[PDB]
mmCIF file of C-alpha atoms and ligand atoms in Angstrom:
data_model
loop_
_atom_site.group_PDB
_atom_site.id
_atom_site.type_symbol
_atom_site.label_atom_id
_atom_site.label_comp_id
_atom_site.label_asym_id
_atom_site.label_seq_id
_atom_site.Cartn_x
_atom_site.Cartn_y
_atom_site.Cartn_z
ATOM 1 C CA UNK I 3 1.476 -21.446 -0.669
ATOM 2 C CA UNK I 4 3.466 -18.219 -0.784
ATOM 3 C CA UNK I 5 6.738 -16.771 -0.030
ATOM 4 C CA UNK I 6 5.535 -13.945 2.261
ATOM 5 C CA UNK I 7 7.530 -15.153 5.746
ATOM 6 C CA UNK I 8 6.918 -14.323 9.239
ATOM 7 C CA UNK I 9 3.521 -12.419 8.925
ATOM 8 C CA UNK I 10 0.726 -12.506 11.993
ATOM 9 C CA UNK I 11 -2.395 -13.905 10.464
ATOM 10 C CA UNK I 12 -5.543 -11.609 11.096
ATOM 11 C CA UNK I 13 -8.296 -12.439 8.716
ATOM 12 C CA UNK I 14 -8.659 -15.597 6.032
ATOM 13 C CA UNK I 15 -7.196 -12.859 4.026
ATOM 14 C CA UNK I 16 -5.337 -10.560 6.045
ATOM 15 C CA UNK I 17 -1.880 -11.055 7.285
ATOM 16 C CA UNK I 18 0.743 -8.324 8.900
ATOM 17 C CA UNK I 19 4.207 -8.005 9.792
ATOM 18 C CA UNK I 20 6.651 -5.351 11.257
ATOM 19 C CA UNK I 21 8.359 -4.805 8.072
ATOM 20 C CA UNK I 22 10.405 -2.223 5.556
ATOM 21 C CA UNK I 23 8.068 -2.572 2.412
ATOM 22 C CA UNK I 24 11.009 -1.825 0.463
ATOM 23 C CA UNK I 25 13.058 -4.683 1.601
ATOM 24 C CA UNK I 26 10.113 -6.774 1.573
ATOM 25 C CA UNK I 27 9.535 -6.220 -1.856
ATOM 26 C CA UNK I 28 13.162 -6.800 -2.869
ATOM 27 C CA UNK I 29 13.327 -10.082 -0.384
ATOM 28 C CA UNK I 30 9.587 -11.097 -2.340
ATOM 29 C CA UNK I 31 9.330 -9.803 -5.508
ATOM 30 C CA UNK I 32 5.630 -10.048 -5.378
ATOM 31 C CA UNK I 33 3.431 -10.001 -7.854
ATOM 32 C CA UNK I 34 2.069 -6.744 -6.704
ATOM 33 C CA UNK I 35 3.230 -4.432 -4.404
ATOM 34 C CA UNK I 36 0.608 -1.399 -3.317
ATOM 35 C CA UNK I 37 1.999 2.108 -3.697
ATOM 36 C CA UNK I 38 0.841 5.436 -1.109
ATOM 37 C CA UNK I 39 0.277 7.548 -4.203
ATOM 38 C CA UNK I 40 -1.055 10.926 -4.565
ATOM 39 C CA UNK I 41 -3.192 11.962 -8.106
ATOM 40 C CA UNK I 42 -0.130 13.296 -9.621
ATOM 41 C CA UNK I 43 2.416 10.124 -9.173
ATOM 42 C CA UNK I 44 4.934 12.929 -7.447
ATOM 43 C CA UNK I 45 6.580 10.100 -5.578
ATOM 44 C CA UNK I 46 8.260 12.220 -2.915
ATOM 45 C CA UNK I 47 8.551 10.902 0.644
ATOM 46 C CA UNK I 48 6.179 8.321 3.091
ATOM 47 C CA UNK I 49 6.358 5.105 1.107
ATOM 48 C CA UNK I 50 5.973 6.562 -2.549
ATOM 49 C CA UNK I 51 9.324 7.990 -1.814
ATOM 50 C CA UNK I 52 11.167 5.349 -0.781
ATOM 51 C CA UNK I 53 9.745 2.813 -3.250
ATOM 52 C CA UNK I 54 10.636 5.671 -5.856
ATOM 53 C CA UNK I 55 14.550 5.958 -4.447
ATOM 54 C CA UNK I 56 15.043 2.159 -4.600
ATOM 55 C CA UNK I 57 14.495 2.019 -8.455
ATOM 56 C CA UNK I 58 17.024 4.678 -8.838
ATOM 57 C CA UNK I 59 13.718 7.148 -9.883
ATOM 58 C CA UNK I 60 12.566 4.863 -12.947
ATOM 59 C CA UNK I 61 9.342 4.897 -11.105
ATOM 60 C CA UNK I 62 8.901 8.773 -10.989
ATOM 61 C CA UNK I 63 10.255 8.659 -14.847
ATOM 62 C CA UNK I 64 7.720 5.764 -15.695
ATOM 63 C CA UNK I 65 4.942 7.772 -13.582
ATOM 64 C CA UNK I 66 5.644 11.268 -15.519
ATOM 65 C CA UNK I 67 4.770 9.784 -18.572
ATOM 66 C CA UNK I 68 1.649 8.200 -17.597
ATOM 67 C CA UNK I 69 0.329 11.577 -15.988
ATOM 68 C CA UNK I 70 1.576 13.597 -19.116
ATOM 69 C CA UNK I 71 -0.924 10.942 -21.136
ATOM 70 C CA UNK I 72 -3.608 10.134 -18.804
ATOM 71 C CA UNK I 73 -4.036 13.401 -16.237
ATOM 72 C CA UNK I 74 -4.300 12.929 -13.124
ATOM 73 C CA UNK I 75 -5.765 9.548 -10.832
ATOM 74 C CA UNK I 76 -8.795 10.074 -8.688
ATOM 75 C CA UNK I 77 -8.472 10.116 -5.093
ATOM 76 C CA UNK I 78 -9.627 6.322 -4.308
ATOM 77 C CA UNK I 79 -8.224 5.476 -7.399
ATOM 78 C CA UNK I 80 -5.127 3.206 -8.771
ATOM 79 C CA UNK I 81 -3.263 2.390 -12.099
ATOM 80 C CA UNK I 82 -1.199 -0.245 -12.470
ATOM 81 C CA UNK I 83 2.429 -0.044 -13.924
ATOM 82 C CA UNK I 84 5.673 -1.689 -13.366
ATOM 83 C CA UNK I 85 6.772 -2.734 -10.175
ATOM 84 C CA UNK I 86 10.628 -2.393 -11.486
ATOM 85 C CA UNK I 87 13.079 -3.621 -9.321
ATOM 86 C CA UNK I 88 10.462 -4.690 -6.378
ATOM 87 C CA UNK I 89 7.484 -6.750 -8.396
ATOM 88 C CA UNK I 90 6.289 -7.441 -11.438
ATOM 89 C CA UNK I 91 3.538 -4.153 -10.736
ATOM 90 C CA UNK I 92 3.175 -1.771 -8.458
ATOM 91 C CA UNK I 93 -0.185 -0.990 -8.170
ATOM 92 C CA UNK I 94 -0.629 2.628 -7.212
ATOM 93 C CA UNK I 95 -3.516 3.994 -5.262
ATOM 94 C CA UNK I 96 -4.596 7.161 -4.104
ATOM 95 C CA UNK I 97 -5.710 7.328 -0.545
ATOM 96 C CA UNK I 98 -7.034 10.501 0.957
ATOM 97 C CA UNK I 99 -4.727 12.173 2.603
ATOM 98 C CA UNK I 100 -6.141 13.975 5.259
ATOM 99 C CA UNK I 101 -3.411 16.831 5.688
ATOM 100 C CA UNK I 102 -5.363 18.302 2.696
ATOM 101 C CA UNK I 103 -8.897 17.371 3.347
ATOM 102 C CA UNK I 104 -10.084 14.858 1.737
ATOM 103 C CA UNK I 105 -12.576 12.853 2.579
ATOM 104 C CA UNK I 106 -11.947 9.762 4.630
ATOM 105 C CA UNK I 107 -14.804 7.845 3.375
ATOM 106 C CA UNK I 108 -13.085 7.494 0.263
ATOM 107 C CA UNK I 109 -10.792 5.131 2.398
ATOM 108 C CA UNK I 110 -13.377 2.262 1.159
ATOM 109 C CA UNK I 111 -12.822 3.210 -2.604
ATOM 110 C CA UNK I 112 -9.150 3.531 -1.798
ATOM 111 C CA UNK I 113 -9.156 -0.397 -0.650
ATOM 112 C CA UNK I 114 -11.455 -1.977 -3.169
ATOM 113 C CA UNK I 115 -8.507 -1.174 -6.176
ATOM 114 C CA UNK I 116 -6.968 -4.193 -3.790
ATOM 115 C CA UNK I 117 -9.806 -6.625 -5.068
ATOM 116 C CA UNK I 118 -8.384 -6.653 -8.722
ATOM 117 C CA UNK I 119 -5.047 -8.675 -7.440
ATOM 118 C CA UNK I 120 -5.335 -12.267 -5.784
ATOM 119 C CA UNK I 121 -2.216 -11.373 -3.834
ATOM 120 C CA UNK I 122 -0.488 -7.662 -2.683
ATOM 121 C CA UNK I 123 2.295 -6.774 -0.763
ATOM 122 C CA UNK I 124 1.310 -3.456 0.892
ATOM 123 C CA UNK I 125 0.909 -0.458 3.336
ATOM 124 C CA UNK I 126 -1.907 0.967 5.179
ATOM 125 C CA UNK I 127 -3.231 3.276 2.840
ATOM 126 C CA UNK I 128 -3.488 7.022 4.076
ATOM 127 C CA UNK I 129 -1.502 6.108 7.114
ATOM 128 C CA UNK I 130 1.579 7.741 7.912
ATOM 129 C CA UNK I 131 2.164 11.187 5.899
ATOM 130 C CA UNK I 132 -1.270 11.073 4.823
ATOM 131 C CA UNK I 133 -2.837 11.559 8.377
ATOM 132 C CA UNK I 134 -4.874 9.096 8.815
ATOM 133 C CA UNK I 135 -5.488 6.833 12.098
ATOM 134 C CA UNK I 136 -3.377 3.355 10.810
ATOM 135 C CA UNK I 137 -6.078 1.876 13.315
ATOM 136 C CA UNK I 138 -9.177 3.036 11.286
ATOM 137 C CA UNK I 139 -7.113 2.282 8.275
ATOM 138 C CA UNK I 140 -6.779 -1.673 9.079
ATOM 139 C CA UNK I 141 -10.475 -1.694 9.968
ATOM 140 C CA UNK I 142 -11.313 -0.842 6.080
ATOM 141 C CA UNK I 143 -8.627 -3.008 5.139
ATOM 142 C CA UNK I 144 -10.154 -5.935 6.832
ATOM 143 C CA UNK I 145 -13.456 -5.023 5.817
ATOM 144 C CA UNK I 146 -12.889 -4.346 2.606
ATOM 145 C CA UNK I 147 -10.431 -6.458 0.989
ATOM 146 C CA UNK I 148 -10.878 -9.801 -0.086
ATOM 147 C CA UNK I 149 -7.860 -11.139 -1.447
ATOM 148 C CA UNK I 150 -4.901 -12.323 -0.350
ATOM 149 C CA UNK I 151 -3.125 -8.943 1.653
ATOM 150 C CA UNK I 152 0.353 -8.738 3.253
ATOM 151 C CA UNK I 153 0.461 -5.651 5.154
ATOM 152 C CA UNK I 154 3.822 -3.950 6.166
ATOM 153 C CA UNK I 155 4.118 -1.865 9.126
ATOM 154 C CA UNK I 156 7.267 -0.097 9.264
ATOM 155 C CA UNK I 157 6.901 1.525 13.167
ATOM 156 C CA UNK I 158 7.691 -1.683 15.441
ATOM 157 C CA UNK I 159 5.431 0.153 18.174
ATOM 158 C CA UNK I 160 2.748 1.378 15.585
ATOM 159 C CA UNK I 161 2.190 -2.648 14.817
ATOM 160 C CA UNK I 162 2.191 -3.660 18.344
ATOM 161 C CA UNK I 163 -0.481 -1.131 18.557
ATOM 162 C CA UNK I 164 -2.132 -2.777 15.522
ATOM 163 C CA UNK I 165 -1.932 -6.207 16.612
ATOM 164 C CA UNK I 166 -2.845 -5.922 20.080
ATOM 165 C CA UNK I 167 -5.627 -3.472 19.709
ATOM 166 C CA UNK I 168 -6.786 -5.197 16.722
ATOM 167 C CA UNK I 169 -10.789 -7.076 17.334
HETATM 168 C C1 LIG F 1 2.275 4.507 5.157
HETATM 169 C C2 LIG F 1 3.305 5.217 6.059
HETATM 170 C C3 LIG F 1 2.822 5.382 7.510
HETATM 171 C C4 LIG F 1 2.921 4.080 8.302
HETATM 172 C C5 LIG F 1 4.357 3.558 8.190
HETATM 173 C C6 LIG F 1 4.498 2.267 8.990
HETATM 174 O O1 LIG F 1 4.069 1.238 8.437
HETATM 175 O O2 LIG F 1 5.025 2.336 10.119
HETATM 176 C C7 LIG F 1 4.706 3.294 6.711
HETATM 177 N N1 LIG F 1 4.632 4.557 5.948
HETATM 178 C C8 LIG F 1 5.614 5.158 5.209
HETATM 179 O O3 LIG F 1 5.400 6.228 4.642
HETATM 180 C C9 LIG F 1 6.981 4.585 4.940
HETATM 181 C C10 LIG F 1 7.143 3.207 4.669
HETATM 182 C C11 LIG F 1 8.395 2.656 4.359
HETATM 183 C C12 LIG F 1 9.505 3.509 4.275
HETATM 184 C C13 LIG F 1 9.362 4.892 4.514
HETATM 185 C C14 LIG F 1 8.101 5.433 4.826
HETATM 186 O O4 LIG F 1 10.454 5.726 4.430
HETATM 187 C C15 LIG F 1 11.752 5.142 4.612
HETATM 188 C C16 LIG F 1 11.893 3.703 4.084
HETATM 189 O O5 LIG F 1 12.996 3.242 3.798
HETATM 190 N N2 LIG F 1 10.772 2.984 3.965
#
């Protein structure tokens, strides 16, 4: 048992909700909640920028660091670091964002960083900003996580969509 409220079971392992992942995460505090990141942590708008404003930019300041030590991430990769304010981490993975090409097979990659956590609060990854189809992008989600997932959709009519198109 969990404190996740009001989601829409899909899967064993899959559950979704019409939801602010910001607020969630400051209602939750999960144990992990899944960052939209791009290879250089430049947490700028979509979801890395609004989980970036509500810790007053301590993630971007945290996330500047890391890059000055480590370089960049790979696209369909993660790191973990702290969740601040919202979690205990924030596990940030790099989904390809299609607005610059890159490949959408790496979705699959992009979703198995989720199988290193028993439980995640999280996004679609490359939906929104990052051009993917969110319907595509719950398909991989489905089929390729296998932990516990808590999906939050912020577009009321983009998750209606989801849920009743979903098979
Ligand atoms: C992954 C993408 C595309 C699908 C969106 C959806 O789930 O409907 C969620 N996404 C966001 O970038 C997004 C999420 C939360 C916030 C935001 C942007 O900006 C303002 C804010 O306070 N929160």
């Amino acid at each position: 048992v969990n404190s996740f409220s009001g989601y829409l079971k899909l899967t064993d392992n899959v559950y979704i909700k019409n939801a602010d992942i910001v607020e969630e995460a400051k209602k939750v505090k999960p144990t992990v909640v899944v960052n939209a990141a791009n290879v250089y942590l430049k947490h700028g708008g979509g979801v890395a920028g609004a989980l970036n404003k509500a810790t007053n930019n301590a993630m971007q300041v945290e996330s500047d660091d890391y890059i000055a030590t480590n370089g960049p991430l790979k696209v369909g990769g993660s790191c973990v670091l702290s969740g601040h304010n919202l979690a205990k981490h924030c596990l940030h993975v790099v989904g390809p964002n299609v607005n610059k090409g890159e490949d959408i097979q790496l979705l699959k990659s992009a979703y198995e960083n989720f199988n290193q956590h028993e439980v995640l609060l999280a996004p679609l990854l490359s939906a929104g900003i990052f051009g993917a189809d969110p319907i595509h992008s719950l398909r991989v989600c489905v089929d390729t996580v296998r932990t516990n997932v808590y999906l939050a959709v912020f577009d009321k009519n983009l998750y209606d969509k989801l849920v009743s198109s979903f098979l």
